[PDB]
Ligand binder design. Structure first.
Ligand SMILES: [Ca+2]
Length: 173
């Protein structure tokens, strides 16, 4: 399981923060796909999120003007925390805490999202948002299909590569 990057240089965020948030996201999705994440239910077709520097730049605009991403019909998640130590270890922890927000995690785990980008600002407090290309609806079922072994197994979107039992596509629009 390795990060998949598209773009660019709206990627302003230091690699370790990016990879931390991406591994948190896709680590969870891959487990849910294999039906083996305590609390998330049966196996299903799951797309990996592509890390997208364009969506990271959108996340940047959403931090400095909330409401922006909704205008472009995007999913958004937010997480913050007061902290004192190393910035990076603060974030590792915040994500743990984040991962207990049933509401937030619906966007994080939505099987039909295919790309996202996050951004953060330090104020000690850190604030992050991630922007997602697809936003679920309230009550929308996430179950469906099977975890993929080969490309044929991916059905939600055209031209998907199955890897690490996650489906990837660069064209979901
Ligand atoms: Ca393969």
């Amino acid at each position: 399981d390795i990060i998949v990057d598209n773009q660019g240089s709206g990627c302003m965020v230091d690699r370790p923060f990016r990879e931390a948030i991406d591994t948190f996201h896709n680590g969870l999705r891959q487990r849910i796909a294999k039906g083996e994440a305590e609390g998330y239910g049966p196996a299903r077709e799951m797309y990996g999120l592509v890390y997208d520097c364009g969506l990271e730049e959108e996340a940047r605009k959403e931090i400095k003007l909330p409401g922006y991403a909704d205008l472009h019909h995007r999913g958004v998640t937010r997480f913050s925390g007061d902290y004192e130590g190393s910035a990076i270890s603060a974030l590792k922890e915040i994500l743990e805490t984040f991962s207990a927000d049933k509401n937030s995690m619906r966007q994080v785990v939505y099987p039909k999202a295919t790309r996202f980008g996050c951004s953060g600002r330090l104020r000690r407090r850190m604030d992050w948002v991630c922007v997602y290309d697809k936003k679920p609806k309230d009550g929308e079922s996430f179950e469906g299909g099977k975890p993929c072994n080969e490309n044929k197994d991916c059905t939600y979107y055209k031209g998907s590569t199955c890897e690490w039992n996650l489906c990837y596509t660069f064209f979901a629009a």
